[PDB]
Amino acid sequence: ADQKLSDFHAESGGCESCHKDGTPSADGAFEFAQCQSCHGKLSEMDAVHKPHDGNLVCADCHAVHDMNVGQKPTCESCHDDGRTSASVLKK
Ligand code: HEC
Ligand code: HEC
Ligand code: HEC
Ligand code: HEC
Numbered sequence: 272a273d274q275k276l277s278d279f280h281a282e283s284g285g286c287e288s289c290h291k292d293g294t295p296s297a298d299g300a301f302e303f304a305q306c307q308s309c310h311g312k313l314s315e316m317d318a319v320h321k322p323h324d325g326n327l328v329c330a331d332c333h334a335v336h337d338m339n340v341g342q343k344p345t346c347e348s349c350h351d352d353g354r355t356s357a358s359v360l361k362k
Pocket of ligand 3: 310311317323329330356
Protein backbone atom coordinates (compact mmCIF):
# COMPACT_ATOMS: atom_id res chain seq x y z
CA ALA A 272 0.00 0.00 0.00
CA ASP A 273 1.06 3.68 -0.88
CA GLN A 274 2.58 5.06 2.38
CA LYS A 275 3.08 8.64 3.32
CA LEU A 276 6.38 9.60 4.88
CA SER A 277 4.60 10.52 8.14
CA ASP A 278 3.07 7.07 8.32
CA PHE A 279 6.36 5.33 7.55
CA HIS A 280 8.01 7.13 10.46
CA ALA A 281 5.09 6.55 12.81
CA GLU A 282 5.50 2.81 12.36
CA SER A 283 8.94 3.17 14.03
CA GLY A 284 8.19 5.38 17.02
CA GLY A 285 4.57 6.57 16.77
CA CYS A 286 3.24 10.03 16.02
CA GLU A 287 5.37 11.07 19.05
CA SER A 288 8.53 10.36 17.00
CA CYS A 289 8.01 13.87 15.62
CA HIS A 290 5.19 15.47 17.68
CA LYS A 291 5.00 16.14 21.43
CA ASP A 292 2.24 13.84 22.78
CA GLY A 293 1.51 12.98 19.13
CA THR A 294 0.04 16.47 18.67
CA PRO A 295 1.43 19.06 16.21
CA SER A 296 2.92 22.32 17.39
CA ALA A 297 1.87 25.61 15.87
CA ASP A 298 5.22 26.75 14.75
CA GLY A 299 6.98 23.52 13.71
CA ALA A 300 10.13 24.08 15.80
CA PHE A 301 9.66 21.00 17.96
CA GLU A 302 9.20 18.85 14.83
CA PHE A 303 12.27 20.36 13.08
CA ALA A 304 14.35 19.49 16.16
CA GLN A 305 13.06 15.94 15.97
CA CYS A 306 13.97 15.60 12.26
CA GLN A 307 17.51 16.79 13.00
CA SER A 308 17.82 14.53 16.09
CA CYS A 309 17.82 11.53 13.78
CA HIS A 310 19.03 12.90 10.42
CA GLY A 311 21.50 15.62 11.47
CA LYS A 312 21.88 19.16 10.26
CA LEU A 313 21.35 20.72 6.84
CA SER A 314 24.97 21.83 6.72
CA GLU A 315 26.11 18.24 6.84
CA MET A 316 23.84 17.12 4.00
CA ASP A 317 24.17 17.26 0.21
CA ALA A 318 24.17 20.17 -2.18
CA VAL A 319 20.37 20.49 -2.28
CA HIS A 320 20.31 20.79 1.52
CA LYS A 321 23.34 22.91 2.48
CA PRO A 322 22.26 26.32 1.16
CA HIS A 323 19.08 26.05 3.19
CA ASP A 324 20.90 25.75 6.51
CA GLY A 325 19.81 28.62 8.73
CA ASN A 326 16.97 29.56 6.33
CA LEU A 327 14.52 26.64 6.10
CA VAL A 328 13.24 23.87 8.25
CA CYS A 329 12.90 20.37 6.77
CA ALA A 330 9.11 20.71 6.44
CA ASP A 331 9.46 23.69 4.10
CA CYS A 332 10.35 21.08 1.42
CA HIS A 333 9.37 17.67 2.83
CA ALA A 334 5.60 17.69 3.31
CA VAL A 335 5.71 14.43 5.20
CA HIS A 336 1.97 13.93 5.46
CA ASP A 337 1.33 14.82 1.80
CA MET A 338 4.31 13.10 0.16
CA ASN A 339 4.72 9.35 -0.44
CA VAL A 340 7.86 7.65 0.76
CA GLY A 341 9.98 7.91 -2.40
CA GLN A 342 8.54 11.32 -3.50
CA LYS A 343 10.93 14.14 -3.19
CA PRO A 344 10.39 17.84 -3.09
CA THR A 345 10.59 20.11 -6.12
CA CYS A 346 11.85 23.69 -6.25
CA GLU A 347 9.36 25.86 -8.07
CA SER A 348 7.53 27.14 -5.01
CA CYS A 349 10.53 29.30 -4.06
CA HIS A 350 12.92 29.58 -7.03
CA ASP A 351 11.89 30.93 -10.46
CA ASP A 352 14.77 29.53 -12.67
CA GLY A 353 13.44 26.00 -13.24
CA ARG A 354 16.10 24.40 -11.05
CA THR A 355 15.69 20.79 -9.88
CA SER A 356 17.48 18.62 -7.41
CA ALA A 357 19.18 16.98 -10.31
CA SER A 358 20.43 20.28 -11.77
CA VAL A 359 21.94 21.15 -8.37
CA LEU A 360 23.33 17.75 -7.25
CA LYS A 361 24.97 17.05 -10.58
CA LYS A 362 25.90 20.73 -11.17
C1 HEC B 1 7.76 13.26 11.53
C2 HEC B 1 8.38 12.38 10.46
C3 HEC B 1 6.28 13.17 11.62
C4 HEC B 1 5.54 12.09 11.99
C5 HEC B 1 5.97 10.71 12.43
C6 HEC B 1 4.17 12.56 12.01
N1 HEC B 1 4.08 13.88 11.67
FE1 HEC B 1 2.47 15.04 11.73
N2 HEC B 1 3.49 16.56 10.97
C7 HEC B 1 4.91 16.64 10.84
C8 HEC B 1 5.30 17.98 10.51
C9 HEC B 1 6.75 18.47 10.21
C10 HEC B 1 4.21 18.78 10.50
C11 HEC B 1 4.13 20.24 10.21
C12 HEC B 1 4.69 21.10 11.30
C13 HEC B 1 3.94 21.14 12.69
O1 HEC B 1 4.00 22.02 13.33
O2 HEC B 1 3.60 20.02 13.01
C14 HEC B 1 3.07 17.83 10.71
C15 HEC B 1 1.78 18.22 10.78
C16 HEC B 1 0.74 17.48 11.28
C17 HEC B 1 -0.60 17.96 11.49
C18 HEC B 1 -1.14 19.30 11.04
C19 HEC B 1 -1.02 20.40 11.96
C20 HEC B 1 -1.71 21.63 11.49
O3 HEC B 1 -2.40 21.69 10.40
O4 HEC B 1 -1.92 22.54 12.33
C21 HEC B 1 -1.26 16.99 12.20
C22 HEC B 1 -2.69 16.99 12.62
C23 HEC B 1 -0.33 15.90 12.35
N3 HEC B 1 0.86 16.20 11.84
C24 HEC B 1 -0.68 14.66 12.94
C25 HEC B 1 0.12 13.58 12.98
C26 HEC B 1 -0.30 12.25 13.45
C27 HEC B 1 -1.68 11.95 13.98
C28 HEC B 1 0.74 11.42 13.34
C29 HEC B 1 0.84 9.97 13.62
C30 HEC B 1 -0.04 9.08 12.79
C31 HEC B 1 1.83 12.23 12.73
N4 HEC B 1 1.45 13.54 12.56
C32 HEC B 1 3.09 11.77 12.47
C33 HEC B 1 5.72 15.52 11.00
C34 HEC B 1 5.36 14.26 11.44
C1 HEC C 1 14.29 9.29 14.05
C2 HEC C 1 13.39 8.83 15.16
C3 HEC C 1 13.68 10.00 12.93
C4 HEC C 1 12.93 11.15 12.96
C5 HEC C 1 12.42 11.89 14.14
C6 HEC C 1 12.72 11.53 11.53
N1 HEC C 1 13.29 10.62 10.70
FE1 HEC C 1 13.22 10.61 8.73
N2 HEC C 1 13.88 8.78 8.67
C7 HEC C 1 14.39 8.05 9.77
C8 HEC C 1 14.79 6.72 9.30
C9 HEC C 1 15.45 5.71 10.21
C10 HEC C 1 14.53 6.66 7.96
C11 HEC C 1 14.77 5.49 7.09
C12 HEC C 1 16.16 5.51 6.38
C13 HEC C 1 16.16 6.29 5.07
O1 HEC C 1 16.97 7.23 4.95
O2 HEC C 1 15.29 5.91 4.22
C14 HEC C 1 13.98 7.93 7.59
C15 HEC C 1 13.66 8.29 6.29
C16 HEC C 1 13.33 9.57 5.91
C17 HEC C 1 13.22 9.99 4.49
C18 HEC C 1 13.39 9.12 3.32
C19 HEC C 1 14.82 9.08 2.79
C20 HEC C 1 14.96 8.14 1.65
O3 HEC C 1 15.29 6.93 1.91
O4 HEC C 1 14.79 8.50 0.47
C21 HEC C 1 12.98 11.33 4.52
C22 HEC C 1 12.87 12.27 3.37
C23 HEC C 1 12.95 11.72 5.94
N3 HEC C 1 13.16 10.64 6.73
C24 HEC C 1 12.64 12.97 6.37
C25 HEC C 1 12.45 13.33 7.69
C26 HEC C 1 11.93 14.61 8.13
C27 HEC C 1 11.64 15.76 7.20
C28 HEC C 1 11.66 14.51 9.47
C29 HEC C 1 11.01 15.46 10.33
C30 HEC C 1 9.68 16.00 9.87
C31 HEC C 1 12.10 13.17 9.82
N4 HEC C 1 12.55 12.45 8.77
C32 HEC C 1 12.12 12.72 11.12
C33 HEC C 1 14.44 8.51 11.05
C34 HEC C 1 13.88 9.67 11.51
C1 HEC D 1 14.28 21.61 0.09
C2 HEC D 1 15.26 22.70 -0.20
C3 HEC D 1 14.70 20.62 1.10
C4 HEC D 1 14.91 20.84 2.44
C5 HEC D 1 14.84 22.08 3.24
C6 HEC D 1 15.27 19.51 3.00
N1 HEC D 1 15.26 18.54 2.03
FE1 HEC D 1 15.68 16.63 2.25
N2 HEC D 1 15.56 16.35 0.30
C7 HEC D 1 15.16 17.30 -0.65
C8 HEC D 1 15.22 16.68 -1.98
C9 HEC D 1 14.90 17.43 -3.28
C10 HEC D 1 15.67 15.43 -1.86
C11 HEC D 1 16.03 14.49 -2.95
C12 HEC D 1 17.39 14.79 -3.60
C13 HEC D 1 18.60 14.62 -2.66
O1 HEC D 1 19.22 15.70 -2.40
O2 HEC D 1 18.88 13.54 -2.23
C14 HEC D 1 15.91 15.21 -0.37
C15 HEC D 1 16.36 14.04 0.12
C16 HEC D 1 16.43 13.80 1.52
C17 HEC D 1 16.74 12.51 2.04
C18 HEC D 1 17.33 11.33 1.32
C19 HEC D 1 18.82 11.59 0.88
C20 HEC D 1 19.46 10.43 0.13
O3 HEC D 1 20.69 10.45 -0.01
O4 HEC D 1 18.70 9.51 -0.30
C21 HEC D 1 16.60 12.63 3.41
C22 HEC D 1 16.74 11.60 4.46
C23 HEC D 1 16.22 13.99 3.65
N3 HEC D 1 16.10 14.71 2.46
C24 HEC D 1 15.98 14.52 4.90
C25 HEC D 1 15.81 15.89 5.17
C26 HEC D 1 15.80 16.47 6.48
C27 HEC D 1 15.75 15.62 7.76
C28 HEC D 1 15.77 17.83 6.37
C29 HEC D 1 15.89 18.85 7.41
C30 HEC D 1 17.15 18.78 8.25
C31 HEC D 1 15.72 18.02 4.93
N4 HEC D 1 15.77 16.88 4.21
C32 HEC D 1 15.53 19.29 4.34
C33 HEC D 1 14.83 18.56 -0.37
C34 HEC D 1 14.91 19.19 0.88
C1 HEC E 1 11.38 27.88 -0.20
C2 HEC E 1 10.56 27.21 0.87
C3 HEC E 1 12.46 27.08 -0.84
C4 HEC E 1 12.37 25.94 -1.53
C5 HEC E 1 11.16 25.07 -1.83
C6 HEC E 1 13.69 25.65 -2.10
N1 HEC E 1 14.61 26.62 -1.73
FE1 HEC E 1 16.48 26.80 -2.32
N2 HEC E 1 16.67 28.44 -1.23
C7 HEC E 1 15.74 29.01 -0.41
C8 HEC E 1 16.31 30.11 0.35
C9 HEC E 1 15.57 30.90 1.40
C10 HEC E 1 17.58 30.20 -0.07
C11 HEC E 1 18.63 31.24 0.36
C12 HEC E 1 19.16 32.11 -0.79
C13 HEC E 1 18.00 32.66 -1.60
O1 HEC E 1 17.59 32.15 -2.75
O2 HEC E 1 17.38 33.58 -1.25
C14 HEC E 1 17.84 29.15 -1.04
C15 HEC E 1 19.02 28.94 -1.70
C16 HEC E 1 19.27 27.93 -2.58
C17 HEC E 1 20.53 27.69 -3.27
C18 HEC E 1 21.84 28.57 -3.14
C19 HEC E 1 22.05 29.35 -4.44
C20 HEC E 1 20.89 30.34 -4.63
O3 HEC E 1 20.03 30.25 -5.54
O4 HEC E 1 20.79 31.26 -3.77
C21 HEC E 1 20.43 26.53 -3.99
C22 HEC E 1 21.47 25.84 -4.83
C23 HEC E 1 19.07 26.10 -3.76
N3 HEC E 1 18.37 26.98 -2.95
C24 HEC E 1 18.54 24.98 -4.34
C25 HEC E 1 17.27 24.53 -4.19
C26 HEC E 1 16.74 23.30 -4.83
C27 HEC E 1 17.50 22.42 -5.73
C28 HEC E 1 15.43 23.19 -4.40
C29 HEC E 1 14.45 22.19 -4.82
C30 HEC E 1 14.74 20.77 -4.38
C31 HEC E 1 15.18 24.32 -3.53
N4 HEC E 1 16.31 25.13 -3.38
C32 HEC E 1 13.99 24.58 -2.89
C33 HEC E 1 14.41 28.59 -0.32
C34 HEC E 1 13.87 27.48 -0.94
